[PDB]
């Protein structure tokens, strides 16, 4: 196929937009999540080093609402066309259905504009996947996944972008119970999730936890420098 | 490949067939990794192996009918299949736009990927059984894994096969012919008489079938093309007896032996035929 | 594989051979039919390959009830001693992933048969044109090096318009001139493996409107004429060649069966 | 040829082809003839038979399309009843507002026009059709006009339209139209219409046949039945 | 004729050679990527199941909701494209609603299918915003319900065309198992008879091997409403294979 | 290609169509505008091939406000849709704002008129470059739109056939010491020097702008200033 | 080879003609045969039903749309679906504004005007759906048939889907002996010709007709499964 | 969105050149001449006049419905060359432009102003992608205050001007040539040795003496300014004054 009416079924059916924009997110820089007991961690690498950068600005990490974060990858503007439109939505929400919303109904909603840019010749598919992570209602853990195509389902935990599936069968290969009973282990497992795929150690690798009901706690440079506090727990306790 | 917007370019494709824009090394890796992909493997069913000297250098042969299209292989079946026994030696293992998801499969009873037969008093004869649509380069793939470029000169081939009544061409409309009707083509080395008329001057054939019958006349094999105009391609009575003067034909004459039982194994058939689609399409 | 129609020697050691390129109208093709229906050439043998997408007829070419039974494919070679001529017929198109190594199977074949001149049939998109080339004559013509050095006056006289090669790396001023033909199919890569071999042979083109091209078609054999003579020197004012390129009988109705009596 | 893809584009030398592609549409169509006579207009059209099964008087070519006003298409069917059913507006917009009846000149110049709009617009394909416009009336006698898809209008004193138009028109010309009556002119129109006919190709047609004028005063109306039989057996004995 | 230029289904809405819209059956088997479903509609009731071929390990299955139920006695199964396959199920329980209220009864299965059938075939009016797709969409459906019928199944296909069939099979495997269950179907069959033979036959189709988790399945019969059967469930019905 | 659509950027990000628009600038007829210390003078060539042509039933020189005068170098109907539309704008700002137009947001309006032509798509780029003269404050203002909507402010350009050696003619025998009276006679001079075709009286419309505003000269007032 | 020009419906070829036109003419008689008599005084509907799809009930073919019109469908079943539910809609409207039932000679008229509009415009495709309607008002019993042509056909008895040129041939023979026949001879003609479509070693079953009826005091009501028992029993074979 | 232009330099009007020529415009230009007439439009001091072919190739057609001079206002009338419709169309458009300009302005719209605007509506199609260009080329005469009598004459390009003397169709150049040859030296042209010369310049550049069925006629003079027509009862008279000489 060719230009005209941008999404056109493939000879088998193939949607070739759709795909073409899947390849986009494998070039985007590596995120991943992990729905705990009582925490949520949302890990993500920035290997575009940049050191001469506002570290602040480009964070993988925004937050949706009081009771939602969540991390992407792929082409960085649309993202944030998808996170301004989620926050208005969220905010339409809680004055008219007054409630914090819960994350599913946010992922739903964030599929269903993401599935809208299909039709329409017009519009294009947007070329991001997202991490929806928060805290319910209930103050139950969650977290949803979606794809340009659509979907929005969910998982324990899981990883898009750069190298996502090393990162997920490394990740069932050491999800356990014995692995998330502790916050610290909660978070040390991304910590060596990226590290399979980081730039050769704790480099600017941005991350961020929710614990529950309370708010999203920026991981930070500390003094300790608690990323790479729980990069030389795995440096010297790996052996 | 335009509106996308308003007041743009249309580009038109080509007249030649030429929109392939008249190669780099991951483009031939990647071509070899494809060309290895879609292998027609001429498999010895549930042994899959013993077959890479083609059926004219791996067994010599005297007859080879071949039906190509869905009524044409409803039509051979039934008509013969019945008649004698035939076991299969093999198939070929095809993937293309049709016969696709995961070809290895209960053979396809509601489908087909060239299946072949021969019989046990003369097994010299050859029944291929397939509407799979092979692609272009796959055709000459599997001429040569089946014949090779060695042709004998003791096999005689049959070849059916249907196209829709719309694509012939004449001086009266279509919609006017009696459909469906038959049409022909011999090879220059084919001497033996017909028993329908030879196709029109303009109206051609171009497809699988072409390439079989291009293959036997070039190499001074005679074989003979029988080919019927219909209006459905659907699994249909009419134009299976559409080709029934081919009961009379000199390569056909000690084959078919009863016809009713043949008008009831249809019967069956076709009652439980394929679930094709309530669109009227 | 070029088989001849009997086993025979077609001892080719110095005919012109002739060729179409498949290009847009298929003006090529159309334009050998035309040559061959109009000097007769007769069927000797076949060039066998496993390149094109098959197709078979009967004989495009028939004029009487016995040539009209005669079997043809895509691919069929017509030959005419007579005036030192041979012929290459090309009816379908070409499969992806395969023109190129078909072309060089064709020159390997030309060397091992050894014809004398290569000439080529071709067209290309007439949207695709220059204002210089617009502004002019659809009528183009290249010749190998090999070959032009001792035809060159022929050409000088005859007021044909060479075609400016092209930067194949165009946005650097210094990138040589090459060649670029738009909607060309094949007859770039032949004109550059042609030129590879020193293989004296001839690429002329047209540029191409849309739909019919027997207009197109006989423009291009008379472009074929003036240079090769291979028919009686048209005299422009034709008295004879407006009845004389006799139309092969196959050119039977084109665009469809006929008017469905049901809407009208 | 060649650049005939759209009516908005112009030829090398400056034609439209898909005007021109309109004029050989309406050749395929079967002969259609009026003819303007001393003191009214008088139609007639051959209509093929395609099967004995069609009722009488299916795919109607002498439409009705006021009270005083007669038209007879010839081309596409379809585009023609669409044309025929405009005509029936323009005519109320012409007498729902300016109260008297629509005068021929008029009704042309605006059909003409529409055509013409139609014929100058890549969005839309010129109607395969042209058709004729017959009237009658004490102030402004009786007149003829012809519209052919290309947008052109012109008065007749006699004309046809369809595959035998060169032939219709040399038997028409040989007769003194400007000072015969309708009793003697249907007659001849039906002379013309069956020496004309083609049958070894169009074999199965039937006659038609209607007029407005001083018989009907300016009425439009098909012609009595009986009338058309004695007609009928002229033309045949007129062999 | 020679093979020339043609443009194919530049317009959306091109009708083929021989008169057959391409991309109505560019849909019809871009659907056979779809997972194979299977419903019963025998008189006790209507059962629906379906794979949901799980991927890979890391996603809890529960997130696939592959059934859904379109209201109380109105159960909906889907193979395909899932992602507009959601809209039409909101389109079917907002029309259910509406002809609730407005029409104080439930609305019957056959006019929901009805409607849905009609929400489709909206394809070009690429210069109109509001209404669009300019693509059929590419989900089979199966509605399940009861009612002054009782029983019922429909079947969509993408291409706005439905039946009264009962015991109908869609997706990948869609032909071998509509072929075995057509020699498997039984004209009186009792509840369970219509799990146990279609949860055979799954068992005989998927790649897979099957457990609670691998598929699910749903059943309404006349004497209430939608019910989606949990784990437990599912291991007290494959107990007996 | 890449060259068709006017929509999108070349393999090398660079406008064709553009350039295009540029070329066809290029083909248009001389035109000239020259800056003085007291004011500004237009002159430009017309092409009226046959004597049966009135020159002066239509112009090629434009009014537009007191102070504001219009040439270009392309083809004439995009230039008087141009000014007829600048008109518009210009009376816009009188009416909103009571004191006529600077030159310059009027040549921000125009600028922005034509780019949305560039930036739209199915509507061809406006193949003319256009020329203002104006009077701002008491002091002489010159600006040289670009059909690209880019706008260009000079002490002296020359547009037009052959307008590479008219500006390189200009370059060596302009200075920002002149007047308006010598400017008018070296403006003729440059028009000379890629004339073709042997000035007459009637063959250039010329106008200037100074404090008492822009206005034309009459054919009498060529023929006054060629006299010497 | 005019195969630039069979690719939009809004683009002539150079021969007068439209491709897309008569492509959709080919597209219906890929649907399902039937059967369009007429009577004196009865217009009923012969059909023939997909049975292809066994083990699952069938699709339905002659659909009510007002007491004193039916119609039949052989095309598009998408375009049946709009055209049927625009032939409801019409017949509401007049009932309504008029309270009297729309005569056919203008329902088909309009039929034709509206499907006449994606013939002439860019970006639309023919109604690809071939309608038998049966009618009776005032005038009397009236059968009209429609192509996607945009054009109509008034005839007395006619036949569209596979095959029908059989039907319509021996339609044309038996055309004297329709003008009188009460409602059960009628209707079996109809089956004969139906029947004849057919292969001889099939036989119309009560599982595939649709016969459907309308008359002078018999509203239009269609004749589903065994209910067309008595219409289709007594049949002589071929 | 809409079907859109066709790929090519000569495909499409908006399509620049490399030199940025449009060339749907010349192919309008040479599209012109179709029809085969050619007119030619000449104004004195007193009247303006413009004469052209009657081409009758058929006697089944009326003399009175086929012309090509169309009144446009009682005061304002054109000619017309091209095909047949867009002329149609475009005395329609001017016909509704003029009638328009005196309802919103109140005074007769001058016959420069009239050419203007049918100026701009031919230009506004060399901008848009799915507009054609009128291919019909129009000619104005009248008399506006003290100016006399003046002569216009737009094209599908846009471009128009005065003209003391023009000319369109097929002869054109020829028309020209002898228009500047004949307004160099002879240029009083009161009534009769006036225009008549332009009836001399179309006879000499097409055929043998012309007689009058095929020749039409329409002028304004200053002295009695209506748009009007006259006859084979005037302009034989005056072709036979012509004839003499």
Same mark, same amino acid.
């Given at each position: ?25 494998? !070039? ?7 729905? *705990? ?5 949302? *890990? ?15 964070? !993988? ?94 998982? !324990? ?59 999203? !706690? ?22 | 490949?335009?509106?996308? =917007?308003?007041?743009?370019?249309? &580009? ?24 290895? &992909? ?25 007859? =080879? ?47 087909? =990927? ?32 089946? =014949? ?20 012939? &061409? ?96 249809? &019967? ?14 | ?5 009997? +086993? ?31 000097? @007769? ?16 007829? @009967? ?14 494919? @895509? ?15 090309? %009816? ?11 072309? +060089? ?29 617009? %502004? ?56 550059? +493996? ?57 050119? %039977? ?12 | ?169 040399? $038997? ?15 007659? $001849? ?9 083609? $049958? ?40 | ?241 | ?19 295009? #628009? ?6 248009? #007829? ?12 237009? #002159? ?108 260009? #402010? ?75 | ?91 509401? /409207? ?42 009776? /008002? ?64 099939? /036989? ?35 | ?245």
């Amino acid at each position: 196929s060719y230009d005209r009416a941008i999404t056109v079924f493939s000879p088998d059916g193939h949607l070739f937009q759709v795909e073409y924009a899947q390849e986009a997110v494998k !070039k985007g820089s590596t995120a991943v999540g992990v729905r *705990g007991r009582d925490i949520v961690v949302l *890990g993500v690498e920035k290997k575009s080093v940049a050191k001469l950068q506002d570290e602040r600005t480009v964070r !993988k990490i925004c937050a949706l609402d009081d009771n939602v974060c969540m991390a992407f990858a792929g082409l960085t503007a649309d993202a944030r066309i998808v996170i301004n439109r989620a926050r208005v939505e969220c905010q339409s929400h809680r004055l008219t259905v007054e409630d914090p919303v819960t994350v599913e109904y946010i992922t739903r909603y964030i599929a269903s504009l993401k599935q809208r840019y299909t039709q329409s010749n017009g519009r294009r598919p947007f070329g991001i996947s997202a991490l929806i992570v928060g805290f319910d209602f209930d103050g139950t853990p969650r977290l949803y996944q979606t794809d340009p195509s659509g979907t929005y389902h969910a998982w !324990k935990a899981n990883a898009i972008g750069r190298g996502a599936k090393s990162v997920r069968e490394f990740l069932e290969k050491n999800y356990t119970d014995e692995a998330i009973e502790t916050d610290d282990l909660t978070i040390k497992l991304v910590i060596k999730a990226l590290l399979e795929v980081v730039q050769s150690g704790g480099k600017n690798i941005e991350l961020a936890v929710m614990r529950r009901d309370q708010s999203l !706690k920026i991981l930070n440079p500390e003094e300790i420098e608690k990323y790479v506090a729980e990069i030389e727990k795995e440096k010297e306790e790996n052996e | 490949m335009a509106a996308t =917007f308003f007041g743009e370019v249309v &580009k038109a494709p080509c007249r030649a067939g030429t929109e392939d824009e008249e190669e780099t090394p991951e483009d031939r890796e990647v071509r070899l990794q494809l060309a290895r &992909k879609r292998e027609v493997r001429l498999l010895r069913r549930q042994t899959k192996t013993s077959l890479e000297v083609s059926l004219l250098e791996k067994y010599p042969c005297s007859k =080879f009918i071949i039906a190509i299209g869905n009524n044409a292989v409803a039509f051979l079946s039934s008509f013969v299949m019945n008649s004698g026994v035939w076991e299969e030696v093999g198939c070929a293992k095809l993937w293309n736009e049709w016969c696709r998801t995961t070809d290895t499969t209960h053979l396809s009873s509601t489908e087909a =990927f060239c299946v072949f037969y021969h019989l046990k008093s003369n097994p010299s004869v050859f029944l291929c059984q397939c509407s799979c649509y092979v692609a272009e380069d796959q055709q000459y793939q599997w001429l040569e894994k089946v =014949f090779g470029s060695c042709p004998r000169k003791n096999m005689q081939i049959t070849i059916l096969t249907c196209r829709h009544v719309t694509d012939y &061409k004449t001086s009266e409309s279509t919609g006017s012919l009696p459909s469906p009707f038959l049409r022909a083509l011999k090879t220059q080395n084919f001497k033996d008489s017909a028993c329908c008329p030879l196709l029109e001057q303009p109206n051609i054939v171009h497809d699988l079938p072409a390439a079989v019958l291009s293959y036997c006349q070039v190499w001074k094999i005679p074989a003979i093309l029988y080919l019927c105009y219909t209006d459905v391609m659907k699994l249909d009575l009419i134009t299976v007896e559409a080709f029934k003067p081919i009961l009379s034909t000199r390569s056909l004459k000690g084959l078919v032996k009863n016809i009713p039982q043949s008008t009831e194994i249809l &019967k069956k058939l076709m009652t439980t035929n394929e679930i094709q689609s309530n669109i009227y399409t | 594989m070029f088989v001849p129609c009997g +086993e025979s020697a077609p001892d080719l050691a110095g005919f012109t051979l002739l060729m179409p390129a498949v290009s847009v109208g298929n003006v090529g093709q159309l334009a050998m039919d035309l040559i061959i229906s109009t000097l @007769n050439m007769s069927k000797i043998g076949y060039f066998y390959t496993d390149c094109l997408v098959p197709m078979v007829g @009967n004989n495009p070419y028939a004029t009487t009830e016995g040539n009209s039974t005669e079997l043809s494919i @895509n691919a069929e070679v017509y030959s005419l001693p007579s005036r030192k001529l041979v012929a290459l017929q090309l %009816r379908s198109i070409f499969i992806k992933y395969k023109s190129k190594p078909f072309c +060089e199977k064709l020159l390997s074949w030309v060397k091992s048969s050894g014809c004398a001149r290569v000439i080529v049939l071709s067209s290309s998109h007439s949207y695709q044109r220059n204002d210089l080339q617009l %502004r002019s004559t659809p009528f183009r013509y290249l010749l190998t090096p090999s070959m032009q050095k001792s035809v060159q006056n022929k050409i000088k006289s005859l007021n044909w318009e060479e075609m400016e090669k092209s930067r194949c790396i165009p946005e650097i001023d210094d990138s040589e001139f090459c060649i670029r033909i738009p909607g060309g199919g094949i007859t770039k890569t032949l004109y550059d +493996e042609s030129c590879s071999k020193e293989i004296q042979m001839a690429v002329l083109l047209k540029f191409v409107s849309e739909g019919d091209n027997i207009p197109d078609a006989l423009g291009l054999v008379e472009y074929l004429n003036e240079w090769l003579q291979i028919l009686k020197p048209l005299s422009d004012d034709p008295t004879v060649s407006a009845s004389r390129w006799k139309i092969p009988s196959s050119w %039977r109705l084109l665009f469809g069966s006929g008017l469905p009596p049901a809407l009208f | 040829t060649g650049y005939d893809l759209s009516a908005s584009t112009f030829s090398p030398d400056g034609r439209v082809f898909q005007v021109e592609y309109a004029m050989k549409a309406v050749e395929n169509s079967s002969t259609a003839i009026g003819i303007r006579c001393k003191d009214g207009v008088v139609f007639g059209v051959e209509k093929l038979v395609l099967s004995k099964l069609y009722e009488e008087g299916s795919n109607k070519r002498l439409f009705n399309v006021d009270r005083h006003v007669g038209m007879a298409v010839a081309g596409l069917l379809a585009d023609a009843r669409s044309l025929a059913d405009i005509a029936r507006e323009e005519a109320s917009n012409f007498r729902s507002n300016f109260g008297y009846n629509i005068p021929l000149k008029h009704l042309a110049d605006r059909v003409a026009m529409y055509v013409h709009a139609y014929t100058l617009y890549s969005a839309v394909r010129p109607f395969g059709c042209s058709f004729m416009l017959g009237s009658y009336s004490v102030n402004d006698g009786a007149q003829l006009y012809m519209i052919d898809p290309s947008g052109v209008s012109y008065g007749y004193w006699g004309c046809a339209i369809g595959k035998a138009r060169q032939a219709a028109k040399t $038997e028409i010309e040989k007769l003194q139209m400007k000072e015969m009556t309708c009793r003697d002119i249907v007659k $001849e129109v039906a002379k013309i219409i069956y020496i004309v006919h083609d $049958e070894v190709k169009d074999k199965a047609f039937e006659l038609e046949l209607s007029w407005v004028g001083e018989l009907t005063n300016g009425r439009h109306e098909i012609v009595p039945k009986d009338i058309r039989e004695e007609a009928e057996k002229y033309a045949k004995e007129s062999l | 004729m020679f093979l020339t230029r043609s443009e194919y289904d530049r317009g959306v809405n091109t009708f083929s050679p021989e008169g057959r819209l391409f991309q109505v059956e560019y849909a019809i088997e871009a659907i056979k990527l779809g997972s194979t479903a299977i419903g019963i509609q025998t008189s006790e009731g209507v059962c629906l199941a379906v794979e949901k071929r799980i991927t890979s390990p890391l996603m809890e299955p529960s997130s696939i909701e592959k059934i859904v139920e379109i209201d109380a006695h109105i159960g909906c199964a889907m193979s395909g494209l899932i992602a507009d396959a959601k809209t039409l199920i909101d389109k079917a329980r907002v029309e259910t609603q509406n002809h609730w209220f407005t029409y104080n009864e439930t609305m019957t299965v056959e006019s929901v299918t009805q409607a849905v059938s009609n929400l489709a075939l909206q394809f070009g009016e690429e210069d109109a915003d509001p209404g669009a797709m300019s693509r059929p969409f590419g989900v089979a459906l199966l509605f399940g319900g009861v009612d002054e019928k009782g029983p019922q199944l429909f079947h969509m296909d993408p291409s706005g065309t439905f039946v009264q069939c009962d015991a109908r099979a869609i997706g990948s495997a869609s032909e071998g198992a509509q072929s075995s269950l057509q020699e498997v179907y039984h004209k009186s069959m009792t509840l369970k008879e219509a799990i146990k033979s279609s949860l055979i036959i799954l068992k005989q189709v998927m790649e897979e091997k099957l457990n609670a988790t691998n598929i699910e399945l749903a059943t309404v019969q006349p004497g209430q409403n939608f019910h989606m059967f949990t784990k437990e469930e599912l291991e007290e019905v494959i107990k007996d294979i | 290609g890449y060259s068709f659509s006017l929509t999108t950027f070349s393999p090398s990000g660079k406008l064709v169509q553009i350039e295009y #628009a540029l070329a066809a600038v290029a083909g248009g #007829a001389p035109s000239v505008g020259i800056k003085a210390a007291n004011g500004v003078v237009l #002159a430009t060539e017309k092409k009226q091939k046959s004597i049966l042509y009135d020159e002066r039933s239509v112009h090629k020189v434009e009014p537009i406000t007191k102070h504001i005068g219009l040439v270009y170098s392309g083809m004439g109907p995009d230039y008087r849709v141009l000014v007829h539309r600048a008109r518009k704008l210009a009376q816009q700002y009188y009416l909103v704002y009571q004191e006529p137009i600077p030159t310059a947001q009027l040549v921000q309006r125009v600028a922005s008129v034509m780019q949305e032509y560039t930036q739209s798509g199915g509507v061809r780029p406006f193949g003319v470059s256009l020329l203002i003269c104006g009077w701002n404050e008491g002091r002489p203002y010159l600006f040289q739109s670009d059909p690209s909507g880019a706008y260009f #402010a000079w002490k002296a350009t020359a547009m037009g056939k052959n307008y590479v050696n008219g500006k390189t003619f200009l370059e060596k025998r302009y200075n920002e010491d002149l007047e308006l009276e010598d400017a008018i006679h070296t403006a003729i001079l440059t028009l000379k020097e890629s004339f073709e075709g042997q000035m007459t009286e009637d063959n250039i419309e010329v106008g200037i702008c100074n404090e008492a505003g822009f206005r034309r000269l009459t054919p009498t007032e060529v023929k006054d200033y060629l006299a010497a | 080879f005019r195969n630039q020009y069979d690719n939009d419906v809004t683009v002539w070829s150079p021969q007068g003609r439209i491709h897309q036109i008569e492509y959709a003419m080919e597209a219906v008689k890929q649907g399902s045969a039937t059967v369009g008599l007429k009577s004196k005084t009865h217009a009923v509907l012969v059909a023939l039903k997909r049975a292809q799809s066994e083990l699952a009930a069938h699709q339905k073919k002659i659909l009510h749309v007002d007491n004193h019109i039916g119609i039949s469908i052989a095309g598009l079943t998408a375009d049946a679906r709009l055209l049927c539910n625009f032939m409801r809609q019409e017949c509401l /409207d007049s009932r309504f504004v008029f309270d009297r039932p729309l005569p056919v000679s203008r329902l088909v008229s309009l039929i034709g005007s509206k499907t006449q509009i994606p013939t002439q415009r860019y970006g639309r495709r023919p109604y690809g759906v071939g309608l038998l309607i049966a009618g009776y /008002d005032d005038m009397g019993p009236h059968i009209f048939q429609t192509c996607p042509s945009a054009n109509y056909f008034d005839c007395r008895a006619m036949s569209i889907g596979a095959r029908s040129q059989s039907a319509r041939t021996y339609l044309e023979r038996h055309m004297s002996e329709f003008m009188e026949c009460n409602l059960n001879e009628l209707v079996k003609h109809g089956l004969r010709a139906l029947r004849e479509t057919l292969p001889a070693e099939q /036989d119309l079953t009560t599982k595939n007709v649709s016969i459907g009826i309308v008359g002078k005091d018999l509203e239009f009501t269609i004749y589903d499964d065994d209910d067309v028992s008595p219409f289709l029993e007594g049949l002589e074979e071929r | 969105m809409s079907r859109g232009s066709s790929a090519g330099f000569d495909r499409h009007i908006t399509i620049f050149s490399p030199e940025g020529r449009l060339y749907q415009v010349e192919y309008a230009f040479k599209a012109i001449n179709q029809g085969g007439l050619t007119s030619v439009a000449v104004r004195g001091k007193d009247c303006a006049v413009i004469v052209t072919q009657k081409k009758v190739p058929d006697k089944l057609l009326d003399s009175s419905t086929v012309t090509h001079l169309f009144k446009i206002t009682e005061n304002i009338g054109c000619v017309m060359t091209g095909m047949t419709a867009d002329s149609r169309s475009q005395v329609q458009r001017a016909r509704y432009e003029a009638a328009n300009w005196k309802y919103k302005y109140g005074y007769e719209i001058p016959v420069d102003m009239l050419c203007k605007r049918i100026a701009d509506i031919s230009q506004v199609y060399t901008q848009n992608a799915e507009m054609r260009p009128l291919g019909c080329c129009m000619i104005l005469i009248g008399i506006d205050e003290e100016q006399g009598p003046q002569v216009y004459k737009c094209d599908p390009a846009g471009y128009y001007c005065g003209f003391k003397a023009t000319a369109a169709g097929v002869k054109q150049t020829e028309s020209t040539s002898f228009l500047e040859k004949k307004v160099k030296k002879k240029f009083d042209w009161t009534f009769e040795q006036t225009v008549e010369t332009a009836i001399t310049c179309l006879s000499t550049v097409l055929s043998i003496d012309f007689k009058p069925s095929e020749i039409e006629v329409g002028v304004v003079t200053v002295e009695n300014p209506k748009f009007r027509i006259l006859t084979e009862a005037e302009i034989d008279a005056h072709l036979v004054a012509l004839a003499e000489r």
